[PDB]
Design a protein around this ligand. Structure first.
Ligand SMILES: c1ccc2[nH]ccc2c1
Ligand SMILES: [Cl-]
Ligand SMILES: [Cl-]
Length: 162
Protein backbone atom coordinates (compact mmCIF):
# COMPACT_ATOMS: atom_id res chain seq x y z
CA UNK A 1 0.00 0.00 0.00
CA UNK A 2 1.15 3.60 -0.48
CA UNK A 3 -0.23 7.20 -0.33
CA UNK A 4 -1.76 6.97 -3.82
CA UNK A 5 -3.60 3.79 -3.16
CA UNK A 6 -4.62 5.02 0.26
CA UNK A 7 -6.13 8.27 -0.96
CA UNK A 8 -7.70 6.47 -3.95
CA UNK A 9 -9.62 4.33 -1.50
CA UNK A 10 -10.59 7.30 0.67
CA UNK A 11 -11.64 9.68 -2.14
CA UNK A 12 -12.96 7.42 -4.88
CA UNK A 13 -12.76 8.34 -8.53
CA UNK A 14 -15.41 10.44 -10.37
CA UNK A 15 -15.11 11.68 -13.94
CA UNK A 16 -17.96 14.08 -13.77
CA UNK A 17 -18.25 17.18 -11.55
CA UNK A 18 -19.77 16.21 -8.20
CA UNK A 19 -20.29 17.61 -4.70
CA UNK A 20 -18.00 16.47 -1.90
CA UNK A 21 -19.06 15.69 1.68
CA UNK A 22 -19.11 19.45 2.39
CA UNK A 23 -21.21 20.19 -0.72
CA UNK A 24 -18.30 21.61 -2.80
CA UNK A 25 -17.76 21.02 -6.48
CA UNK A 26 -15.10 18.43 -6.99
CA UNK A 27 -13.95 16.01 -9.69
CA UNK A 28 -11.61 13.03 -10.18
CA UNK A 29 -9.83 11.80 -7.06
CA UNK A 30 -10.90 14.37 -4.52
CA UNK A 31 -9.77 17.37 -6.56
CA UNK A 32 -11.66 20.31 -5.10
CA UNK A 33 -12.54 22.76 -7.79
CA UNK A 34 -14.13 25.61 -5.87
CA UNK A 35 -16.07 26.47 -2.79
CA UNK A 36 -18.39 28.65 -4.73
CA UNK A 37 -21.97 27.52 -5.03
CA UNK A 38 -21.82 28.12 -8.76
CA UNK A 39 -21.57 25.25 -11.27
CA UNK A 40 -20.33 27.66 -13.86
CA UNK A 41 -17.56 28.83 -11.73
CA UNK A 42 -16.69 25.14 -11.17
CA UNK A 43 -16.67 24.31 -14.86
CA UNK A 44 -14.40 27.28 -15.55
CA UNK A 45 -12.05 26.16 -12.81
CA UNK A 46 -12.12 22.72 -14.33
CA UNK A 47 -11.19 23.97 -17.83
CA UNK A 48 -8.44 26.12 -16.42
CA UNK A 49 -6.93 23.09 -14.56
CA UNK A 50 -7.14 20.61 -17.54
CA UNK A 51 -6.32 23.08 -20.19
CA UNK A 52 -9.34 22.47 -22.41
CA UNK A 53 -13.00 23.02 -22.80
CA UNK A 54 -14.09 20.01 -20.83
CA UNK A 55 -17.81 20.46 -20.48
CA UNK A 56 -17.70 19.17 -16.85
CA UNK A 57 -16.22 15.76 -17.80
CA UNK A 58 -12.62 14.43 -17.85
CA UNK A 59 -10.92 11.24 -18.71
CA UNK A 60 -9.28 8.83 -16.30
CA UNK A 61 -5.80 9.96 -17.43
CA UNK A 62 -6.70 13.58 -16.74
CA UNK A 63 -8.00 12.52 -13.30
CA UNK A 64 -4.78 10.69 -12.50
CA UNK A 65 -2.85 13.65 -13.66
CA UNK A 66 -4.68 16.05 -11.28
CA UNK A 67 -4.14 13.49 -8.55
CA UNK A 68 -0.34 13.33 -9.07
CA UNK A 69 -0.24 17.05 -8.95
CA UNK A 70 -2.29 17.28 -5.79
CA UNK A 71 -0.26 14.69 -3.91
CA UNK A 72 3.00 16.40 -4.85
CA UNK A 73 1.57 19.77 -3.82
CA UNK A 74 0.46 18.42 -0.43
CA UNK A 75 3.84 17.08 0.43
CA UNK A 76 5.48 20.20 -0.75
CA UNK A 77 3.19 22.30 1.40
CA UNK A 78 3.89 20.27 4.48
CA UNK A 79 7.63 20.68 3.86
CA UNK A 80 7.25 24.45 3.58
CA UNK A 81 5.18 24.67 6.69
CA UNK A 82 7.18 25.54 9.76
CA UNK A 83 4.55 23.98 12.09
CA UNK A 84 4.10 20.87 10.08
CA UNK A 85 7.51 20.04 8.85
CA UNK A 86 9.11 19.10 12.13
CA UNK A 87 6.27 16.76 12.94
CA UNK A 88 6.31 15.18 9.60
CA UNK A 89 10.07 14.68 9.80
CA UNK A 90 9.69 12.83 13.06
CA UNK A 91 7.35 10.24 11.67
CA UNK A 92 7.98 6.86 10.06
CA UNK A 93 6.92 6.21 6.41
CA UNK A 94 3.41 4.77 7.15
CA UNK A 95 2.51 7.60 9.47
CA UNK A 96 3.78 10.18 6.96
CA UNK A 97 1.17 8.77 4.63
CA UNK A 98 -1.55 9.46 7.23
CA UNK A 99 -0.22 13.03 7.63
CA UNK A 100 -0.46 13.63 3.83
CA UNK A 101 -4.00 12.18 3.76
CA UNK A 102 -5.13 14.71 6.37
CA UNK A 103 -3.57 17.65 4.44
CA UNK A 104 -5.06 16.45 1.21
CA UNK A 105 -8.44 16.41 2.78
CA UNK A 106 -8.47 19.52 4.91
CA UNK A 107 -5.64 21.68 3.80
CA UNK A 108 -2.57 22.80 5.62
CA UNK A 109 -4.65 25.27 7.46
CA UNK A 110 -7.23 22.85 8.61
CA UNK A 111 -4.41 20.67 9.92
CA UNK A 112 -2.43 23.45 11.53
CA UNK A 113 -5.44 23.65 13.98
CA UNK A 114 -4.68 20.20 15.48
CA UNK A 115 -1.85 21.68 17.57
CA UNK A 116 -2.36 19.42 20.54
CA UNK A 117 -2.54 16.26 18.46
CA UNK A 118 0.61 17.20 16.52
CA UNK A 119 2.53 17.68 19.66
CA UNK A 120 1.44 14.22 20.83
CA UNK A 121 2.40 12.63 17.56
CA UNK A 122 5.76 14.30 17.63
CA UNK A 123 6.23 12.83 21.10
CA UNK A 124 5.16 9.34 19.77
CA UNK A 125 2.37 9.05 22.37
CA UNK A 126 0.28 7.09 19.92
CA UNK A 127 -2.72 6.21 22.00
CA UNK A 128 -3.17 9.59 23.41
CA UNK A 129 -2.83 11.24 20.03
CA UNK A 130 -5.57 8.94 18.63
CA UNK A 131 -7.88 9.90 21.35
CA UNK A 132 -7.19 13.60 20.93
CA UNK A 133 -7.55 13.37 17.13
CA UNK A 134 -11.07 11.94 17.52
CA UNK A 135 -12.26 15.00 19.43
CA UNK A 136 -12.69 17.05 16.28
CA UNK A 137 -15.21 18.23 13.77
CA UNK A 138 -13.26 16.10 11.25
CA UNK A 139 -13.97 12.93 13.16
CA UNK A 140 -17.68 13.74 13.66
CA UNK A 141 -18.25 14.65 10.06
CA UNK A 142 -16.32 11.86 8.29
CA UNK A 143 -16.06 9.19 10.91
CA UNK A 144 -15.15 6.17 8.83
CA UNK A 145 -12.35 7.90 6.97
CA UNK A 146 -11.14 9.57 10.19
CA UNK A 147 -11.08 6.16 11.95
CA UNK A 148 -8.90 4.71 9.17
CA UNK A 149 -6.39 7.56 9.35
CA UNK A 150 -6.42 7.53 13.19
CA UNK A 151 -5.79 3.77 13.19
CA UNK A 152 -2.90 4.39 10.91
CA UNK A 153 -1.30 6.87 13.28
CA UNK A 154 -2.04 4.67 16.24
CA UNK A 155 -0.53 1.55 14.85
CA UNK A 156 1.92 2.59 12.22
CA UNK A 157 0.50 -0.18 9.94
CA UNK A 158 -1.86 -0.26 6.91
CA UNK A 159 -4.28 -2.50 8.73
CA UNK A 160 -7.22 -0.10 8.40
CA UNK A 161 -6.83 -0.19 4.66
CA UNK A 162 -6.60 -3.97 4.28
C1 LIG B 1 2.31 17.01 9.08
C2 LIG B 1 1.17 17.18 8.32
C3 LIG B 1 -0.03 16.67 8.71
C4 LIG B 1 -0.05 15.96 9.91
N1 LIG B 1 -1.08 15.31 10.55
C5 LIG B 1 -0.59 14.72 11.68
C6 LIG B 1 0.75 14.94 11.78
C7 LIG B 1 1.11 15.74 10.66
C8 LIG B 1 2.30 16.31 10.25
CL1 LIG C 1 -5.07 22.85 -10.65
CL1 LIG D 1 -16.52 8.78 6.38
Amino acid sequence: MNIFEMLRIDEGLRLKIYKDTEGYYTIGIGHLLTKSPSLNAAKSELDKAIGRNTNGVITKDEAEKLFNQDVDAAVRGILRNAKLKPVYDSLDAVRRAAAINMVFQMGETGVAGFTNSLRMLQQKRWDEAAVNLAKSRWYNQTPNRAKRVITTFRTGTWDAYK
